[PDB]
Enzyme design. Structure first.
Site, PDB file in Angstrom:
ATOM      1  CG  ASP A   1      35.505  37.925  41.142  1.00  0.00           C
ATOM      2  OD1 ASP A   1      35.513  38.764  42.071  1.00  0.00           O
ATOM      3  OD2 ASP A   1      36.272  38.035  40.140  1.00  0.00           O
TER       4      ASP A   1
ATOM      5  CB  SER B   1      42.466  41.993  39.698  1.00  0.00           C
ATOM      6  OG  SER B   1      41.798  42.240  40.933  1.00  0.00           O
TER       7      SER B   1
ATOM      8  CG  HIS C   1      39.223  38.292  41.842  1.00  0.00           C
ATOM      9  ND1 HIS C   1      38.602  39.056  40.881  1.00  0.00           N
ATOM     10  CD2 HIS C   1      40.383  38.938  42.153  1.00  0.00           C
ATOM     11  CE1 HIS C   1      39.323  40.134  40.631  1.00  0.00           C
ATOM     12  NE2 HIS C   1      40.405  40.096  41.395  1.00  0.00           N
TER      13      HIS C   1
END
Lengths: 304, 304, 304, 304
Positions: free
Chosen positions: A243, A150, A273
């Site tokens: 996501d 991320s 995610h």
């Protein structure tokens, strides 16, 4: 559709209330969700201090049970540049250590809003540079690779760009990375709500980390706009079907491939995610860790 | 896949060599491709000069055979802010005039590279403002709507934003509009080459029209980043399946709908960017014109 | 995402409880949802009886206000082969009549479970054949076209196949048609629940209409498996973005185009299966009717 | 887009001319493409004969260098039910053996057109049953799993269905499996040509293996139509982005998940059908083998 296990989980109150509670409270909630996973044994763990250009940088070093020599994976945690830390990512880093048979060095880069962009980038780069020049201290001569999830995957990608013709990174592992400003993609619009990471969270994180809209155009926030992606290390890019960040990550894979960089780009279907952080509750997360382990054992050791 | 008719056409040398010939030569080639279509009769055509804030603005006015009173459609041509003009779009404007039973005013906004952003926006807005205040000269009391294709669709969308609480636009017709900076979408990556409008053309047009990268973040170039899309006129947004620009246009539709603006967003399958300009060779282009005609006859006249 | 207007509607109890209430009750609920729309005036309406090969076939004839001569559109209603009828589709047929300036003949084909496959096909074909040979009774010399929605669109496509080298159909309008057995497409899996038409409804309708699994392989149920699609009439195929039936309809468009049949295939974004039936509540439905009107005025009259 | 390495390869004459050369010649060409990869050492290889219900079934057994006890992977090669064999798949099976630290038993099931459906299914099931009851001969007490690619993945999925409540399969690995009749999916239409496996090849293979169209509806050819997918072994399903077979495989993953079967479904982006067979030329193929190795070491040994 989502894996029913994940749909049940999200319905059952699995949330970080980003932008709807204080920075302290969102950090605390994330700590509890991430830090809940089992901590697999490793051989030895060490906390060290890396002398960065702007700060002393905490890092946690995990040694595998396998005998050396090792490759060293620099790991940069996620959390939208604002939340997460080394200790909440301790279960995931231990899992990676065991999968890769490698030394993992997890970096405590400075967080927003206390430290704005580009503080996280400077610390992530300074840590990677120091680890590269000090591999001997880890019996780490098999080389260095960089990984993150991320926000950390954004930092990993950007460190790979900043390292070109300075360090010799073997590999970049980008685990659903943020790859820059996206006001347009289908995944961003389609999965803006209801899939754990929301558009509102993305905008809130941005509002804490960035200083002005000009930073959106900075390659150290949006590496997909970098002038020249050639000569970067081979990449494994992991994305998740549901996501909002998915499409720009697949675009970044394609841009790397177009620049002659070797890339294995893999979409984990049916998942959201952040899924590696929840590997006890989301089985596919274990298999994504196993894929990271395969790629690193091959790059570092030429082993299966 | 592409309509085989279109695949044959592209294979058979249907190209504008943007970025690979002089500005004069690319303008000339486009003139020949666009201006080749049949010019349907209309009732009367008039060339006028609109007094803009920065220039005298040429416009061509097309009157329909149907009797008044009329709505007035302000039309802004495409061509990447660099090519096209009123006269090359004369066949398409006459086709629209006949479909809509309305007055069409096609605007000759200033072009790059001679005039950079935001010159085209200023002229497009000034023309719309003047037409609104002078509808009586066109027997045009049924009101004003704004339309454009590609670069012109970008200008139409931006004029709709700039008109809020100044003019009373009935409708915006955005025909595969450019809606702003896109370094990330799947359609942009997937259809970057081989579908008439390429990534290289998009980048070349940008390099002529924009003054600096800051302009990318300006809502008058990227309306999708506008702070507030509420209260804009109802939109028809036409997209094409095999067009790099497709995904951001569908995102803009969704953002409008989210802001409570009525939007009919329609993807023409099997076709490419620019297809209305080639309505003699691409049958779907005729049907897209018919769809524009339906929406305008309804908004202006409450007729089928 | 869905148009927020549609999301609100579905959340607010907009449902036909197919497979969860008696055939009588589901028919009644559908009648009320469909028949609620305003009935636009037309010039004249007539109920007639067509002598079919297996039954006397009721049909309702709508004459437009425009003067003749006319084209004649044979219209086959939807309802999964089980529900709907001419009278519930009276608002939609009147809207089409007015848009197309044409005679519309809406056919009451036999319904399942009372009459199984291929009874609906036989009646739809017999009605089209009779109308073709009796166009003079409608001042209908401009020719015949065939249209239907959902189950009716399946019947329209199949009648076009059965008519090759018997009748001279000008055009086929397929409005989110069922095009045959689909156990595999992404849209079918992705939109199986929550978008008005569900997988359970599709399976329930199939269980009433089909006699055995062999019927799945019959081209009169699955026209996409027909041996030869060449020489069929030009098609307008309307699909909806959030519809389980969407992908196979786009495949059928592509197969037609590959067989050299002219096809305009258009996806209405943000909307659901059945949206034309709800044109008072779903604005895009009005614009889809306007698109049908454009294509038919062009084919029949060569008018805009 | 395709990985440029793959695009170059396909452009450079990488083809099996299925349906355009004799069965002998297509078999020979495939042998040369597949059998060209390096044969990694393993500990021991043995050819055995399994007593099947209809034939004596050849199989090749690969023992890993790691010490026992082992799990046993039954491997069924691809080749559209017509081409391939154990010896052409020897490089891929050796690579899998080394990745999984497990015994691999590669099965020579009867091929079409000499032996039609369901001969390949009967042999694949009979071999799996015999291996299960004879695990002791392989020091194989850690259990049995089933794997195959393409046509072999179809057979693996079908054997998993046929084994329910007979054998205790630990896992099914389905590597871009054929999962049944598909006349409708987007991937099938979109990637029908130019991506190594074409629609024409798929139809030609079908025409050799199947006996009649009724076989299309048989769950032993189309497992996606099976009545009940519950209680099947956990699955790893690998798909490739540019593969006509992709969408139905992702549908089968979703159907398994809906039936409560654990599934890790992963799309390898940028690559084509068959890519594991070409792991020397397509790097992602190595990483897909590494992913298979991770999942099997976990299921059999509970090791990383």
């Amino acid at each position: 559709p989502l894996d029913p296990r994940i749909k049940k989980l999200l319905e059952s109150g699995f949330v970080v209330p980003i932008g709807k509670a204080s920075v302290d409270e969102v950090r605390k909630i994330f700590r509890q969700l991430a830090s809940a996973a089992p901590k697999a044994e490793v051989r030895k763990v060490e906390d060290i201090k890396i002398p960065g250009s702007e700060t002393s940088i905490n890092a946690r070093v995990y040694f595998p049970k396998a005998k050396g020599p090792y490759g060293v994976l620099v790991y940069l945690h996620g959390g939208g540049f604002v939340i997460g830390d080394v200790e909440s990512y301790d279960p995931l880093c231990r899992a990676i250590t065991n999968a890769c048979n490698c030394v993992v060095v997890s970096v405590d880069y400075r967080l927003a809003p206390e430290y704005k962009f580009p503080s996280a980038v400077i610390d992530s780069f300074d840590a990677t540079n120091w680890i590269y020049n000090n591999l001997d201290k880890f019996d780490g001569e098999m080389g260095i690779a960089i990984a993150g999830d991320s926000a950390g995957g954004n930092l990993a990608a950007v460190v790979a760009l900043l390292s070109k013709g300075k360090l010799d990174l073997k590999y970049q592992i980008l685990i659903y990375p943020a790859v820059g400003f996206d006001s347009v993609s289908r995944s961003m619009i389609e999965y803006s709500d209801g899939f754990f990471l929301t558009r509102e969270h993305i905008e809130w994180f941005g509002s804490q980390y960035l200083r002005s809209p000009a930073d959106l155009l900075d390659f150290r926030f949006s590496p997909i706009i970098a002038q020249d992606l050639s000569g970067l290390p081979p990449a494994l890019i992991i994305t998740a079907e549901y996501d909002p960040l998915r499409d720009p990550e697949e675009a970044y894979a394609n841009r790397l491939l177009q620049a002659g960089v070797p890339v294995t780009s893999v979409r984990f279907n049916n998942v959201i995610h952040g899924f590696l952080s929840f590997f006890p509750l989301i089985d596919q997360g274990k298999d994504a860790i196993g894929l990271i382990g395969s790629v690193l054992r091959r790059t570092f050791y030429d082993k299966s």
